Coordinates of C-alpha atoms and ligand atoms in Angstrom, one line a residue:
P66 CA 0.0 0.0 0.0
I67 CA 1.0 3.7 0.0
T68 CA 2.4 5.6 3.0
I69 CA 2.3 9.4 3.4
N70 CA 5.6 11.1 4.4
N71 CA 5.7 13.3 7.5
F72 CA 7.6 16.6 7.6
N73 CA 8.4 19.7 9.6
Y74 CA 9.1 22.7 7.3
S75 CA 12.5 23.0 9.1
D76 CA 13.6 19.4 8.3
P77 CA 16.9 19.4 6.4
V78 CA 17.3 18.8 2.7
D79 CA 18.1 15.1 2.1
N80 CA 18.4 15.1 -1.7
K81 CA 15.6 12.6 -1.7
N82 CA 12.3 13.8 -0.2
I83 CA 13.2 17.3 0.7
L84 CA 14.8 19.6 -1.9
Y85 CA 14.9 23.2 -3.2
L86 CA 13.2 23.5 -6.6
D87 CA 12.9 26.2 -9.3
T88 CA 9.8 25.6 -11.3
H89 CA 10.3 28.6 -13.5
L90 CA 6.6 29.3 -13.1
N91 CA 6.0 31.1 -9.7
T92 CA 6.2 34.8 -10.3
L93 CA 6.2 35.3 -6.5
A94 CA 9.5 33.4 -6.1
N95 CA 12.8 35.1 -6.6
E96 CA 14.8 32.1 -5.3
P97 CA 14.5 28.3 -5.2
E98 CA 11.5 27.0 -3.1
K99 CA 11.7 24.3 -0.5
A100 CA 9.7 21.2 -1.6
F101 CA 8.6 18.0 0.1
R102 CA 7.7 14.6 -1.4
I103 CA 4.3 13.5 0.0
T104 CA 4.6 10.2 -1.8
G105 CA 5.9 9.0 -5.1
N106 CA 5.7 11.7 -7.7
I107 CA 3.5 14.0 -5.7
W108 CA 5.3 17.0 -4.2
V109 CA 4.2 20.0 -2.1
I110 CA 5.7 23.5 -2.0
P111 CA 4.0 25.3 0.9
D112 CA 4.3 28.8 -0.7
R113 CA 1.9 31.2 -2.3
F114 CA 1.8 30.8 -6.1
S115 CA 1.2 33.2 -9.0
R116 CA 1.4 33.3 -12.7
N117 CA 0.8 37.1 -13.0
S118 CA 3.8 39.4 -13.8
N119 CA 4.4 41.9 -11.0
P120 CA 2.2 39.9 -8.7
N121 CA 0.2 41.4 -5.8
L122 CA -1.6 39.4 -3.1
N123 CA -3.6 42.4 -1.8
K124 CA -7.3 42.8 -2.4
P125 CA -8.1 43.9 -6.0
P126 CA -9.0 47.5 -6.6
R127 CA -11.6 47.0 -9.3
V128 CA -14.4 44.5 -9.5
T129 CA -13.5 40.9 -10.2
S130 CA -16.7 39.6 -8.6
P131 CA -19.4 38.3 -8.3
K132 CA -16.7 35.6 -7.8
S133 CA -16.3 35.2 -4.1
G134 CA -12.8 36.1 -2.9
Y135 CA -10.6 36.2 0.2
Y136 CA -7.4 38.2 0.0
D137 CA -4.6 38.2 2.6
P138 CA -1.1 39.1 1.4
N139 CA 0.4 37.7 4.6
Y140 CA -1.1 34.2 4.5
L141 CA 1.8 31.7 4.2
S142 CA 4.4 34.5 4.5
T143 CA 6.2 33.1 7.5
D144 CA 8.0 29.7 8.0
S145 CA 5.6 29.1 10.8
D146 CA 2.7 29.4 8.4
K147 CA 4.3 27.1 5.9
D148 CA 4.9 24.5 8.5
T149 CA 1.3 24.5 9.5
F150 CA 0.2 24.4 5.8
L151 CA 2.5 21.5 5.1
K152 CA 1.2 19.5 8.0
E153 CA -2.4 20.2 7.0
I154 CA -1.8 18.9 3.5
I155 CA -0.1 15.8 4.9
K156 CA -2.9 15.1 7.3
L157 CA -5.5 15.4 4.5
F158 CA -3.6 13.0 2.3
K159 CA -3.6 10.5 5.2
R160 CA -7.4 10.9 5.5
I161 CA -7.8 10.5 1.8
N162 CA -5.7 7.4 2.0
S163 CA -8.0 5.9 4.7
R164 CA -10.5 4.7 2.1
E165 CA -9.8 2.4 -0.9
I166 CA -10.8 4.9 -3.6
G167 CA -8.6 7.5 -2.1
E168 CA -5.7 5.1 -1.8
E169 CA -6.1 4.3 -5.5
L170 CA -6.4 8.0 -6.4
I171 CA -3.1 8.7 -4.6
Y172 CA -1.5 5.6 -6.1
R173 CA -2.3 6.6 -9.7
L174 CA -1.3 10.2 -9.3
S175 CA 2.0 9.3 -7.6
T176 CA 2.9 6.4 -9.8
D177 CA 1.8 7.0 -13.4
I178 CA 3.6 9.7 -15.4
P179 CA 2.8 12.1 -18.2
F180 CA 3.9 10.7 -21.6
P181 CA 7.3 12.3 -22.2
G182 CA 6.4 14.6 -25.0
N183 CA 3.8 16.8 -26.6
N184 CA 2.3 17.5 -30.0
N185 CA 5.6 18.8 -31.3
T186 CA 7.8 15.9 -30.1
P187 CA 9.0 13.7 -32.9
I188 CA 7.1 10.4 -33.0
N189 CA 10.3 8.4 -32.4
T190 CA 11.3 10.4 -29.3
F191 CA 10.8 10.4 -25.5
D192 CA 11.4 13.9 -24.2
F193 CA 11.6 14.0 -20.4
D194 CA 12.1 17.8 -20.4
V195 CA 9.1 18.8 -22.6
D196 CA 7.3 22.0 -21.6
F197 CA 7.3 22.2 -17.8
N198 CA 7.4 18.4 -17.0
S199 CA 10.8 18.7 -15.4
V200 CA 11.8 21.1 -12.6
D201 CA 15.3 22.2 -11.6
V202 CA 16.8 21.0 -8.3
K203 CA 19.1 23.7 -6.8
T204 CA 21.6 23.8 -4.0
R205 CA 23.2 26.9 -2.4
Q206 CA 26.9 27.6 -2.3
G207 CA 28.0 31.1 -1.5
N208 CA 25.4 33.8 -2.0
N209 CA 23.9 32.1 -5.0
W210 CA 22.0 29.0 -6.1
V211 CA 23.2 26.4 -8.7
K212 CA 21.3 23.7 -10.5
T213 CA 22.4 20.2 -9.6
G214 CA 19.8 18.3 -11.6
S215 CA 16.1 18.0 -12.0
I216 CA 13.1 15.9 -11.1
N217 CA 9.8 15.1 -12.8
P218 CA 6.9 15.6 -10.4
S219 CA 3.5 14.5 -11.7
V220 CA 1.7 16.8 -9.3
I221 CA 2.9 19.8 -7.3
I222 CA 0.6 21.1 -4.6
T223 CA 1.2 24.7 -3.6
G224 CA -0.4 27.3 -1.4
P225 CA -3.2 29.6 -2.9
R226 CA -2.8 32.1 -5.6
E227 CA -4.2 35.6 -5.3
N228 CA -7.7 34.5 -4.3
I229 CA -7.4 32.2 -1.3
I230 CA -10.8 30.7 -1.7
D231 CA -10.5 29.9 -5.4
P232 CA -8.5 26.6 -5.5
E233 CA -7.0 26.0 -9.0
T234 CA -5.3 23.3 -10.9
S235 CA -3.3 24.0 -14.1
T236 CA -0.8 22.6 -16.6
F237 CA 1.6 24.7 -18.5
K238 CA 3.1 24.9 -22.0
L239 CA 5.6 26.8 -24.2
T240 CA 4.1 29.5 -26.4
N241 CA 4.2 27.5 -29.7
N242 CA 2.7 24.3 -28.3
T243 CA -0.8 23.1 -27.5
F244 CA -1.9 21.7 -24.1
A245 CA -0.6 18.1 -23.8
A246 CA -3.0 17.5 -20.9
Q247 CA -5.9 17.6 -23.5
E248 CA -4.1 15.3 -26.0
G249 CA -3.5 12.0 -24.4
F250 CA 0.1 12.7 -23.3
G251 CA -0.9 14.3 -20.0
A252 CA 1.4 16.8 -18.3
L253 CA 2.6 18.0 -14.9
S254 CA -0.1 19.7 -12.8
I255 CA 0.2 22.4 -10.2
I256 CA -2.6 22.6 -7.6
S257 CA -2.8 25.9 -5.7
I258 CA -5.0 25.5 -2.7
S259 CA -5.7 25.9 1.1
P260 CA -8.2 23.3 2.1
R261 CA -8.8 24.8 5.6
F262 CA -10.7 27.6 4.0
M263 CA -14.0 25.9 3.6
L264 CA -16.9 26.7 1.3
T265 CA -20.3 26.7 3.1
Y266 CA -23.7 25.7 1.7
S267 CA -27.3 24.7 2.6
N268 CA -28.2 22.8 -0.6
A269 CA -26.7 19.5 0.4
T270 CA -26.6 15.9 -0.7
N271 CA -27.8 14.4 2.6
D272 CA -31.2 15.1 4.0
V273 CA -31.0 15.8 7.7
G274 CA -34.7 16.3 8.3
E275 CA -34.9 20.1 8.0
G276 CA -36.7 20.2 4.6
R277 CA -39.9 21.7 6.1
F278 CA -38.1 24.1 8.4
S279 CA -35.0 26.3 8.3
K280 CA -32.0 24.4 6.7
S281 CA -28.6 24.4 8.4
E282 CA -25.5 25.7 6.7
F283 CA -22.7 23.1 6.4
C284 CA -19.1 23.3 5.5
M285 CA -17.2 21.3 2.9
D286 CA -14.9 18.7 4.4
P287 CA -11.3 19.8 3.5
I288 CA -10.5 16.4 1.9
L289 CA -13.2 17.0 -0.7
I290 CA -11.9 20.4 -1.6
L291 CA -8.5 18.8 -2.2
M292 CA -9.8 15.6 -3.8
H293 CA -11.8 17.7 -6.2
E294 CA -8.6 19.3 -7.5
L295 CA -6.9 15.9 -7.5
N296 CA -9.6 14.9 -10.0
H297 CA -8.5 17.7 -12.4
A298 CA -4.9 16.4 -11.9
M299 CA -6.2 12.9 -12.9
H300 CA -7.7 14.2 -16.1
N301 CA -4.4 16.1 -16.8
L302 CA -2.2 13.1 -16.0
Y303 CA -4.1 10.8 -18.3
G304 CA -4.4 13.4 -21.0
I305 CA -8.2 13.7 -21.1
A306 CA -8.7 17.2 -19.8
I307 CA -11.5 19.1 -21.6
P308 CA -10.6 22.6 -22.9
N309 CA -11.8 25.4 -20.7
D310 CA -13.8 26.8 -23.7
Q311 CA -16.2 23.9 -23.4
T312 CA -19.0 25.3 -21.2
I313 CA -22.7 25.5 -20.5
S314 CA -24.1 28.9 -19.5
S315 CA -25.5 28.8 -16.0
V316 CA -26.2 30.8 -12.9
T317 CA -25.3 30.7 -9.2
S318 CA -25.1 33.1 -6.2
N319 CA -21.9 34.0 -4.4
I320 CA -21.4 34.8 -0.7
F321 CA -22.9 38.3 -1.3
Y322 CA -24.4 39.0 -4.7
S323 CA -27.6 37.4 -6.0
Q324 CA -28.1 34.9 -8.9
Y325 CA -25.6 35.7 -11.6
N326 CA -24.6 34.0 -14.8
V327 CA -21.5 31.9 -15.2
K328 CA -19.9 29.7 -17.9
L329 CA -19.8 26.3 -16.2
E330 CA -16.8 24.4 -17.6
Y331 CA -17.3 20.8 -18.6
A332 CA -14.0 20.1 -16.8
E333 CA -15.7 21.2 -13.5
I334 CA -18.8 19.0 -14.3
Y335 CA -16.6 15.9 -14.6
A336 CA -14.5 16.8 -11.5
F337 CA -17.7 17.2 -9.5
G338 CA -19.6 14.3 -11.1
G339 CA -23.0 12.8 -10.2
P340 CA -26.2 13.7 -12.1
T341 CA -24.6 17.0 -13.2
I342 CA -22.7 15.1 -15.9
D343 CA -26.0 14.9 -17.7
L344 CA -25.8 18.7 -18.3
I345 CA -23.3 17.9 -21.0
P346 CA -25.1 16.8 -24.2
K347 CA -24.7 13.1 -24.6
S348 CA -23.3 13.6 -28.1
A349 CA -20.7 16.0 -26.8
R350 CA -19.7 13.6 -24.0
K351 CA -19.2 10.9 -26.7
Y352 CA -17.3 13.4 -28.9
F353 CA -14.7 14.1 -26.2
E354 CA -14.3 10.5 -25.3
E355 CA -13.8 9.5 -28.9
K356 CA -11.3 12.4 -29.3
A357 CA -9.4 11.0 -26.3
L358 CA -9.4 7.5 -27.8
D359 CA -7.9 8.9 -31.0
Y360 CA -5.1 10.7 -29.0
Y361 CA -4.5 7.3 -27.2
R362 CA -4.2 5.6 -30.6
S363 CA -1.6 8.2 -31.6
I364 CA 0.3 7.5 -28.3
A365 CA 0.3 3.7 -29.0
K366 CA 1.8 4.5 -32.4
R367 CA 4.5 6.5 -30.8
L368 CA 5.3 3.6 -28.4
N369 CA 5.9 1.4 -31.4
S370 CA 8.4 4.0 -32.8
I371 CA 10.6 5.1 -30.0
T372 CA 14.3 5.0 -30.9
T373 CA 15.7 8.0 -29.1
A374 CA 15.2 10.0 -25.8
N375 CA 16.1 13.4 -24.4
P376 CA 18.2 13.8 -22.5
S377 CA 20.4 11.1 -23.9
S378 CA 20.9 9.5 -20.5
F379 CA 17.4 8.1 -20.9
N380 CA 18.2 6.2 -24.1
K381 CA 19.1 3.1 -22.1
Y382 CA 15.8 3.2 -20.4
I383 CA 13.5 3.5 -23.4
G384 CA 12.2 -0.1 -22.8
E385 CA 11.5 0.6 -19.1
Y386 CA 9.4 3.7 -19.8
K387 CA 7.6 2.1 -22.8
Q388 CA 6.4 -0.6 -20.4
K389 CA 5.4 1.9 -17.7
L390 CA 3.4 3.9 -20.3
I391 CA 1.8 0.7 -21.6
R392 CA 0.5 0.0 -18.1
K393 CA -0.6 3.6 -17.6
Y394 CA -2.9 3.6 -20.6
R395 CA -3.8 -0.1 -20.3
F396 CA -2.7 -0.8 -23.8
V397 CA -2.4 -4.4 -25.1
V398 CA 0.8 -6.0 -26.5
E399 CA 0.4 -8.2 -29.5
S400 CA 2.4 -11.5 -29.7
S401 CA 4.4 -9.6 -32.3
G402 CA 5.2 -6.9 -29.7
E403 CA 3.2 -4.2 -31.3
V404 CA 1.3 -1.9 -28.9
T405 CA -2.4 -1.6 -29.6
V406 CA -5.4 0.1 -28.0
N407 CA -8.2 -2.2 -26.7
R408 CA -11.5 -0.2 -26.8
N409 CA -13.1 -2.2 -24.0
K410 CA -10.1 -1.4 -21.7
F411 CA -10.2 2.3 -22.8
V412 CA -13.9 2.7 -22.2
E413 CA -13.5 1.3 -18.7
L414 CA -10.6 3.6 -17.9
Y415 CA -12.3 6.7 -19.3
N416 CA -15.4 5.9 -17.3
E417 CA -13.3 5.5 -14.1
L418 CA -11.5 8.8 -14.6
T419 CA -14.6 10.8 -15.4
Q420 CA -17.5 9.2 -13.5
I421 CA -16.0 7.2 -10.6
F422 CA -13.2 9.4 -9.4
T423 CA -15.5 12.3 -8.7
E424 CA -16.2 14.7 -5.8
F425 CA -19.9 13.6 -5.7
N426 CA -18.8 9.9 -5.4
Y427 CA -16.2 10.7 -2.7
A428 CA -18.9 12.4 -0.5
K429 CA -20.9 9.2 -0.4
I430 CA -17.8 6.9 0.1
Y431 CA -16.3 9.0 2.9
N432 CA -19.7 9.5 4.4
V433 CA -19.6 13.3 4.7
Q434 CA -22.1 16.0 4.1
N435 CA -21.4 17.9 0.9
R436 CA -22.9 20.4 -1.6
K437 CA -25.5 18.8 -3.8
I438 CA -24.3 20.5 -7.0
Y439 CA -21.0 22.2 -8.0
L440 CA -23.0 25.5 -8.3
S441 CA -24.7 25.3 -4.9
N442 CA -25.2 28.7 -3.5
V443 CA -22.5 29.6 -0.9
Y444 CA -22.3 31.6 2.3
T445 CA -19.5 33.0 4.4
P446 CA -16.5 30.6 4.3
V447 CA -15.3 29.0 7.6
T448 CA -12.1 27.6 8.8
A449 CA -10.9 25.5 11.7
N450 CA -7.8 24.1 13.4
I451 CA -7.8 20.8 11.5
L452 CA -4.5 19.7 12.9
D453 CA -6.2 19.4 16.3
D454 CA -7.5 15.8 16.6
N455 CA -10.2 17.1 18.9
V456 CA -11.5 19.1 16.0
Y457 CA -10.7 17.0 12.9
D458 CA -9.3 13.5 12.7
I459 CA -8.3 11.1 10.0
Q460 CA -11.1 8.6 10.5
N461 CA -14.2 10.9 10.8
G462 CA -13.0 14.4 9.9
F463 CA -15.2 16.8 11.8
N464 CA -18.0 14.3 12.7
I465 CA -16.2 12.9 15.7
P466 CA -18.2 10.5 18.0
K467 CA -16.2 11.5 21.1
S468 CA -17.4 15.0 20.5
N469 CA -20.9 13.8 20.0
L470 CA -20.9 15.3 16.5
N471 CA -21.2 12.0 14.6
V472 CA -25.0 12.2 14.2
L473 CA -26.4 13.7 11.0
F474 CA -23.1 15.3 10.1
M475 CA -23.3 17.7 13.1
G476 CA -19.5 18.2 12.9
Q477 CA -20.0 20.0 9.6
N478 CA -23.0 21.9 10.8
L479 CA -22.1 25.6 11.4
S480 CA -24.6 26.1 14.2
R481 CA -23.7 22.9 16.0
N482 CA -19.9 22.8 15.9
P483 CA -18.2 25.8 17.6
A484 CA -14.8 24.6 16.3
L485 CA -15.9 26.1 12.9
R486 CA -15.4 29.8 12.6
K487 CA -16.2 32.3 9.9
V488 CA -13.1 33.6 8.2
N489 CA -11.8 37.1 8.8
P490 CA -14.3 39.4 7.1
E491 CA -11.7 42.1 6.2
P492 CA -10.1 40.0 3.4
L493 CA -13.4 39.0 1.9
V494 CA -14.8 40.5 -1.4
Ligands
ZN1388 ZN1 -12.7 22.2 -10.3

């Protein structure tokens, strides 16, 4: 099985699970960032992250809303903050790992890798440095930092970007390329998030008997906030991500404003899952699945043509990676040795990735209260000291029996659990 590593932010670099990395993507970082290996190819860099030039973490001057936002330029600024964040992420992975589906989710994300290449990679080549799949490992000597090598994370979890309550997962590419995450190859994903900042709602999946009266507000369990993003990472890793331009015009209401229109991305619909998937026209769902199958066929063709690798040191390991990728995509190997795509196996895999590994399904499996739909109306966000086992533990999250909060999800009920507190109102927008 899989085990989650434990760390203190202050723990020494060991050139194995603790290193200093330069992703060449964080506009907030002027020097290498300390990183920790949660397990396998999943790493965490407990720092704020940004993709905007001349970044600013202060509340925006203009109007970016209705989108609910929380801005605090000092969140995660100190080493003390980073240590707490790091431990929160670790604890959440342990809870995710407590159920079989979560163990499988972590196993896949930490074991399978992006195909080494993109649309512009020659068919006979394995490129382990394509786009942003490899990150520099740096060490200090003197008053500077020098590259000593690189690693290939599959997923890097970082702290929030500008808006602390808008978790986001992304892949990156060079200007002249297209997104490999949408073309079968898959690519490295960066998840920017802070699970302890919980979204609140009243339109929930589990009936608690208040239908005819006043319904309680509940918080989202931090593991679902994180697992939701891990679903985007799954789509990105297996190269089946749906372009962000694929949407359905909808409405919802933020923490302040009233019902406003929004373009609901199909990527969000799949990450959430459940009946919501039906919002995507059946013909469109089939279209993207068939498109993915064609990209997979192209990958199988590449696997039958590999003769060189970049960097050259990987040439002697072409067979090893060919086998790893064959297992990832669940391809079949003919007696002749040719790699072929089995439709039955593909359909099963695609279904798993888009309809089984979903937030909606996790809520049922982990037995926690959760929003009924991705666009459930939200209220003021809440937070809690999730590192305190008297507040949140691995087995039951907030719904702890010892606290007498295990009945009807009372642990997640804002008016029944004093451990839950509204976030600072000042940073809210
Ligand atoms: Zn999402």
